[PDB]
């Protein structure tokens, strides 16, 4: 029938990940050095475009 | 020739060069009346193109091209046994479908597949029709009418090769019956090609457990009896001879557990031989060696038949494998809950041989958490080395919280409402919760109750449960039956063995009253609290503060945490009063439930239930009246109305109540009724003995998506609630409720819903053997 | 339930029922019970007037063909076993020659029983059931079995004189391929829409033809229920081919003389150049021999459950399962006579022996009709 | 403490006194790699000192535990068969 | 209930409903134009359209069988970066959307099956596109993603030390070691295989993390 006027009350999303904080690379004595990195874990680091959070693409 | 242009005239799925690179005329070519006709099945390989006409304006190409694709639309009509997205499987398999060219050769070879499909499924008088129905631009609908005349149905097997045994018998001994009577009805009767291979299969194990170790199917042909429906059967097999073991020579690689591997060749030499026993102790080694880690146990058995004696010699081929398989687990469906609350649910450790049953009882933790719906393991070997399993568990997960409601008391004549709520370990983060309360004008009603079941690691269970109830029954004032009652519950839950397991807590209860009813057991339990009230008012005023140590315990060997199939949870439940407390009694209750599967692969299981408990005082102060049995309704019996089973109150002749309205609350006062007033309240019980006959039964009639879930099940219930010091020499005209024969009787069905926040339960049920007294609503919400 | 969600078939009556020769009976005598629901390839038969007449799971009479006076009785729902006095159950048609009773039972047991008491003159297991009712001569049980085994007996005594594997179909493809003798050569069709010719004094195989198509990957009719047991006329054979095809063509060679892949007939008679037919929809028609040309046709009736069609009283005469019998033109199909007999309805086949016409109802078996 | 029901600990990763019969010090890895696999532990940064460990805790008294360290070279050959008991 | 309409105005009738938020019909325009018209110019723009509204309207499973169509269907394109962040950006909200980290708890326990997901398609956007305008954004989301799930398998390290399985501690830890180093909760679990270590007696092993705690605890 109907379901109108203010369905939803404060119900939305965020960008979270981009809120949150960046992180510090561990240091490793001479004589303790142990792999550190298995996979996709090493990523190009990149300022690759920005516009970044709301300003991402929509459409 | 040389084409100067190829004009693609109507193409409605490919692109314009795409139609030209299928073309052998293409602009730029030498052109001849043969790449013309080249053209035309070119343009036909396309497989979307319904009429192509290759024609030219002097060289310059012109293609008539008529165009068979998207078929819109593919409408079903007339299976209403069958899904038509199974018959659309079938149109999956001709690979055409929403999307794909119409073929109007296509249209009885899908016709012959489905009526094909209706071949193998059970029926072949079944035939269908697909009606084209054009739509816009290139467009077609497929109609589809399904002209179902009847199925195919099983009506007799013959077995030929038997010289041992009843073919009708071993149609008892089969899936496949044909017997469903009209006086002596039971079962149903179908037919599937695949369960003949599978009574095969059940033959083969039919013959294999006796020793026949000659024995073979020859093969076994079903009559096309010539009415489309006419399943009769041959079947030939070879008898052969009875063989009996006659030893065992196992061997391999039997990595020094061979004396534990000749505990699970423990036969007798000369018994008639089975194989599933020989099948059974392949698996004991299995298990035998999972729990000694070897998680590919390869065992082959080799029945060495020995004809000239009739017996069997029994070489088995042993491969170990290694202890250490067991690398690491993972962990799967943690998306709404805590790791290590599900990683504490197991035995096998990382770091480890396998222990291949710990899974299992880790899995049966999982399998009684019951805040899953599939818990599944996978263990994958991982590769580099057999030292390495990763077992995965991916695990379903199961809804959270459980409301209950009853709309009463107001809803316009104020803000009044029942309430209470659940969270179900406060969705799996480790801490059970269960709420309830009520906010009336009769009664402020509040109660807390919360659990870490795992405190420790060691299970440490710490419950608590409060409460505070401002029980006033407020129709003027404070006058009629008042309660402020509250107070808490400390308790731990105990460990005792990985199913045995004791409660105990310390509770507390501090209850404030006032101007009570001329319920006079009331009044006698005031005379056995060394109160001398006066009988004839509610004026009597009341506080108490009562200290109680509680204690329990509970068994565990019982399939589901929420949806169990086989065993029993039998769970102790008491309390007693301590030093210090105003009253010096005590209660026990003892509450079972036993789980017997009627089908084994539980279509049909037996439920066990009672509900022992007592109590009483522990030398003159007694156990309270509101701590007696009240049943009824719902609560394990339904029928009734709730708490309407018990010993039932009579009114003192009564003068004045603090509350004496214009004949609206009628207490024996001076509103009328001035005298002695036996009333059909059911004021419980010190004894209660109940029990119910609940049965497993499934669903046929809906979606078994959501069956799996449903609980149907018909319940039949009694009951008999007293109390024993009932001294009917004071109940002169009143029956006696000192008598554990206060047989009551309903019996009833049980319709839980399973919803996406917890279960809907609801039943109706019909008392037909009743103690009277009790107020009956035969349709039960149990919300 | 079950009752409720019922799916029927519907199929076209039985029209113009004729009186115009009004039919009766000579006498019923029946046997009592047969075959019921219980479909087999039983079919009565009578000779020097005894109807050889029995109960398929029960007694085994000898009916005096005058009133079907019981002239013997004995029964094979004897000597006990899993059933203790185990039944009779027949499959195949009842076959009397010479002295011997000759059956073959749903048992797989086949029977010599002597014609005068029906003493048992000798007995065989059948390995396995059999498709076809044994045409017993020249010395040999000759059987197509269930599973599609030659197995000649020694009509004395049941001495195997070979057993020879036939051409085999997936499962139970129903259907008649009875073999029978046909200037020395054993002939048989098959119910794998193959056709084939075997010695029929060793069981060597002569020819063998794949004709038509049968169910799975080319999927045929169970309404058309094809006699694949061949009749030889000289020796181009007219035979039938399972899904019901029509072919002629040389007993020597197996090579076609011509063929109709168009036949979805059920029950044959070669009654001269006119071949006698019940289609699938039970439409008559009157073939050629020269090719399946309509000399004469009757799609009057329609869609029942027919016997195979005999000539009685000069009248092509056919039953069905129904009940019903009929009295149809040897020429162009006019119902002469009509008779709605009983309800028991008619599996088996009309017997036309001795002058007479035997039939068989389902389990009100003999009437002996006449008009 | 005082309490009772305690369920018991274990832990694998542990071959018998046979398998250390099975090898000698100058033995490879892998030829300890053959017949007796991987450990579940070696050194990370370290050499190549293979870890087949037990655990186990019995009731009220403790944690049994058999320790050994297999000292294989930069090359992994071995070079000390380190056995320890429980404490 | 969407007639074939002119499939342009269709295409402008959910673009108000994308404008207005009503992905409940916006979507109703966007299916019967795919159903009608899926191989049209910006058909393939509904797709990127059809992930944004399933995204939008909440429709990942949905969404992620359309993120697979433009895989086959336009296995090169220049819009792939769009979708290759959205097929993480499905897979950031597929692991996590739940109501519990609205009442302040912690999610980085829950199952990272997703946030691997997650994990792979980022990466694969800023190998595969480098420069896009998600590959600023895509960055951080893996930043604070290898402490996900550090802090998801820290959560696994924990409770093996409350078993006592040190080895199974240290097997985590190692797998810690093996994926990341600038996660702090690998500072967090620095001492504590050291602590197993000790447990197991392994204390000259100890004295070697005791100089890496050297090492980070500066």
């Excluded at chain 2, 061979?258 to 194989?275: D, H």
């Excluded at chain 2, 979606?703 to 010091?725: C, E, H, I, L, P």
């Excluded at chain 3, 009940?323 to 086949?349: C, M, P």
């Excluded at chain 5, 190692?174 to 702090?184: A, K, S, V």
Aim: hydrophobic letters at 35%; aromatic letters at 10%; charged letters at 20%.
């Amino acid at each position: 029938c109907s379901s109108d006027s203010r369905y939803k009350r404060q119900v939305s999303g965020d960008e979270a990940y981009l809120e949150a904080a960046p992180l510090a690379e561990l240091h490793a004595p001479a004589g303790m050095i142990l792999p550190v990195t298995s996979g996709d874990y090493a990523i190009p680091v990149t300022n690759g475009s920005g516009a970044v959070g709301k300003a991402l693409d929509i459409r | 020739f040389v084409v100067k242009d190829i004009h693609f005239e109507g193409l409605q799925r490919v692109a314009v060069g795409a139609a030209l690179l299928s073309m052998p005329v293409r602009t730029g070519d030498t052109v001849n009346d043969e790449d013309i006709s080249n053209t035309i099945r070119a343009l036909f390989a396309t497989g979307n193109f319904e009429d192509v006409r290759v024609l030219r304006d002097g060289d310059t190409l012109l293609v008539q091209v008529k165009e068979r694709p998207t078929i819109a639309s593919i409408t079903f009509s007339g299976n209403k046994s069958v899904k038509d997205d199974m018959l659309k499987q079938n149109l999956e398999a001709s690979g055409v479908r929403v999307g794909e060219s119409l073929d109007r050769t296509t249209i009885a070879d899908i016709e012959k597949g489905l009526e094909d499909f209706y071949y193998s499924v059970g029926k072949y008088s079944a035939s269908v029709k697909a009606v084209v129905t054009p739509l816009p631009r290139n467009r077609v609908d497929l109609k589809l009418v399904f002209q179902e005349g009847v199925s195919a149905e099983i009506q007799q097997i013959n077995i030929v090769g038997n010289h041992a045994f009843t073919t009708d018998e071993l149609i008892s001994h089969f899936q496949l019956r044909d017997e469903v009577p009209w006086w002596n009805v039971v079962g149903d009767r179908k037919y599937q090609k695949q369960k003949l291979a599978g009574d095969l299969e059940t033959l083969r194990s039919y013959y294999l457990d006796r020793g026949y170790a000659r024995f073979n199917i020859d093969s076994t042909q079903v009559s096309l009896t010539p009415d489309k429906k006419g399943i009769y059967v041959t079947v030939n097999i070879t008898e052969g001879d009875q063989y009996k073991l006659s030893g065992v020579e196992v061997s391999g690689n039997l990595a020094g557990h061979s004396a534990e591997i000749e505990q699970l060749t423990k036969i007798e030499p000369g018994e008639l031989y089975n194989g599933t026993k020989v099948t059974k102790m392949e698996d004991d080694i299995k298990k035998l060696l999972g729990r000694y880690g070897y998680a590919y146990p390869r065992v082959q058995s080799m029945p060495e038949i020995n004809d000239a004696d009739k017996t069997v010699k029994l070489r088995v081929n042993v491969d170990a494998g290694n202890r250490f398989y067991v690398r690491k687990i993972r962990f799967e469906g943690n998306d709404t809950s805590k790791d290590a609350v599900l990683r504490r649910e197991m035995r096998q450790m990382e770091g480890a041989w396998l222990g291949s049953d710990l899974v299992d009882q880790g899995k049966e933790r999982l399998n009684r958490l019951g805040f899953f719906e599939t818990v599944d393991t996978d263990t994958q070997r991982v590769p580099g080395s057999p030292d390495q399993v990763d077992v995965v568990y991916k695990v379903k997960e199961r809804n959270t919280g459980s409301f209950n409601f009853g709309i009463g008391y107001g809803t316009e004549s104020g803000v009044s409402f029942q309430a209470g709520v659940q969270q179900d370990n406060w969705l799996g983060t480790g801490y059970a919760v269960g709420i309830n309360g009520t906010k009336n004008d009769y009664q402020t009603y509040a109660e807390l109750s919360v659990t870490n079941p795992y405190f420790t690691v060691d299970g440490v269970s710490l419950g608590g449960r409060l409460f505070y109830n401002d029980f006033q029954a407020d129709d003027a004032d404070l006058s009629d039956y008042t309660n402020k009652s509250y107070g808490t519950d400390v308790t731990l839950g105990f460990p005792i063995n990985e199913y045995n397991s004791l409660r105990a807590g310390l509770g507390y209860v501090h209850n404030s009253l006032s101007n009570m009813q001329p319920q006079v057991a009331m009044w006698r339990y005031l005379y056995s609290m060394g109160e001398h009230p006066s009988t004839s008012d509610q004026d009597n005023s009341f506080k108490t503060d009562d200290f109680t140590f509680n204690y329990g315990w509970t068994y565990n060997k019982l399939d589901r945490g929420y949806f169990p199939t086989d065993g029993s949870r039998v769970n102790l439940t008491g309390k007693v009063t301590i030093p210090g407390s105003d009253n010096e009694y005590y209660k026990v209750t003892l509450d079972t439930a036993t789980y017997v599967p009627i089908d084994d692969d539980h279509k049909w299981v037996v439920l066990g239930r009672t509900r022992w408990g007592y109590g009483d005082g522990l030398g003159g102060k007694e156990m309270p009246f509101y701590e007696n049995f009240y049943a009824g309704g719902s609560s394990t019996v339904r029928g009734f109305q709730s708490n309407t089973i018990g010993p039932k109150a009579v009114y003192f002749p009564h003068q004045a109540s603090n509350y004496d309205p214009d004949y609206d609350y009628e207490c024996a006062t001076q509103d009328g009724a001035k005298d002695l007033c036996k009333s059909d309240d059911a004021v419980g019980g010190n004894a209660m003995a109940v029990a119910s006959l609940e049965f497993i039964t499934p669903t046929p009639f809906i979606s078994d998506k959501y069956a799996n879930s449903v609980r149907t099940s018909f319940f039949w219930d009694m009951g008999t609630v007293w109390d024993t010091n009932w001294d009917s020499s004071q109940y002169s005209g009143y029956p006696d409720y000192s008598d554990p024969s206060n047989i009551r009787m309903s019996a009833g069905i049980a319709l839980q819903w399973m919803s996406p926040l917890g279960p809907l339960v609801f039943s109706y049920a019909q008392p037909f053997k009743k103690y009277d007294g009790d107020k009956a609503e035969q349709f039960q919400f149990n919300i | 339930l079950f009752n409720s969600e019922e799916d029927v078939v519907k199929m076209s009556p039985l029209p113009t029922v004729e009186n115009q020769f009004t039919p009766t009976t000579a006498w019923s005598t029946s046997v009592g019970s047969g075959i019921g629901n219980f479909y087999s390839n039983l079919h009565p038969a009578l000779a020097d007037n005894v109807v050889y007449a029995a109960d398929r799971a029960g007694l085994v009479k000898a009916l005096n063909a005058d009133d079907g006076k019981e002239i013997w009785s004995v029964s094979l729902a004897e000597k006990d076993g899993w059933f203790s006095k185990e039944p009779a159950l027949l499959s195949g048609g009842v076959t009397v020659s010479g002295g011997h009773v000759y059956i073959g039972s749903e048992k797989a047991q086949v029977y010599a029983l002597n014609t005068s008491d029906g003493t048992v003159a000798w007995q065989t297991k059948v390995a396995g059931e059999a498709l076809s009712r044994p045409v017993v001569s020249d010395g040999l049980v000759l059987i197509h079995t269930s599973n599609g085994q030659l197995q000649a007996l020694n009509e004395a005594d049941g001495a195997v004189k070979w057993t020879v594997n036939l051409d085999m179909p997936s499962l139970s493809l129903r259907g008649e391929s009875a073999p029978t003798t046909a200037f020395g050569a054993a002939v048989v069709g098959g119910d794998n829409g193959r056709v084939s010719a075997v010695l029929m004094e060793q069981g060597q195989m002569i020819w063998q033809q794949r004709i038509s198509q049968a169910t799975g990957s080319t999927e045929i009719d169970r309404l058309s229920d094809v006699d694949t047991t061949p009749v030889v006329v000289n020796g181009v054979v007219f035979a039938l081919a399972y899904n019901g095809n029509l072919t002629a063509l040389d007993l020597r060679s197996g090579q076609i003389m011509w063929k109709r892949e168009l036949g979805s007939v059920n029950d044959f008679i070669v009654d001269g150049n006119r071949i006698y037919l019940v289609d699938q929809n039970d439409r008559v028609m009157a073939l050629t021999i020269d090719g399946g040309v309509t000399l004469w046709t009757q799609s009057d009736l329609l869609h029942r459950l027919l016997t195979s069609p005999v000539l009685y009283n000069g009248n092509l005469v056919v039953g069905d399962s129904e009940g019903y019998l009929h009295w149809i033109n040897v020429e162009d199909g006019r119902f002469v006579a009509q008779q709605k007999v009983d309800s028991s309805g008619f599996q088996t086949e009309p017997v036309a022996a001795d002058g007479k016409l035997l039939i068989q109802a389902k389990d009100g078996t003999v009437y002996s009709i006449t008009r | 403490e005082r309490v009772v029901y305690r369920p018991d600990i274990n832990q694998g990763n542990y071959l018998t006194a046979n398998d250390v019969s099975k090898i000698r010090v100058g033995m490879t890895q892998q030829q300890v790699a053959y017949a007796l696999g991987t450990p579940l532990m070696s050194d990370p940064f370290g050499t190549n000192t293979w870890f087949y460990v037990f655990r186990q805790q019995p009731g009220h008294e403790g944690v049994t535990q058999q320790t050994l360290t297999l000292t294989f070279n930069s090359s992994g050959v071995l070079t000390n068969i380190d056995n320890k008991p429980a404490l | 209930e969407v007639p074939d309409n002119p499939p342009n105005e269709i295409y402008a009738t959910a673009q108000q409903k994308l404008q207005d938020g009503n992905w409940r019909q916006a979507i109703t325009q966007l299916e019967a134009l795919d159903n009608r018209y899926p191989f049209g110019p910006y058909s393939q723009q509904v797709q990127l359209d059809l992930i944004y509204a399933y995204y939008k309207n909440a429709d990942l499973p949905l969404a992620q069988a359309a993120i697979d169509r433009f895989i086959r269907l336009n296995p090169t394109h220049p819009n792939i970066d769009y979708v290759m962040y959205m097929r993480g950006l499905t897979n950031m909200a597929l692991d996590d959307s739940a109501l519990q980290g609205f009442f302040g708890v912690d999610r980085s326990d829950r199952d990272p099956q997703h946030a691997r997901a997650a994990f792979s398609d980022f990466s694969k956007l800023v190998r595969g596109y480098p420069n896009s305008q998600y590959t600023t954004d895509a960055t951080k989301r893996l930043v604070f993603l290898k402490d996900r799930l550090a802090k998801y398998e820290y959560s696994v390290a924990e409770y093996y030390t409350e078993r006592g399985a040190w080895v199974a501690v240290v097997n985590r830890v190692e797998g810690m070691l093996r994926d990341y180093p600038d996660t702090q909760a690998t500072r967090d679990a620095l001492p504590l295989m050291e602590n197993a270590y000790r447990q197991m007696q392994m204390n000259a092993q100890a004295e070697k993390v005791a100089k890496i705690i050297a090492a980070n605890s500066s």
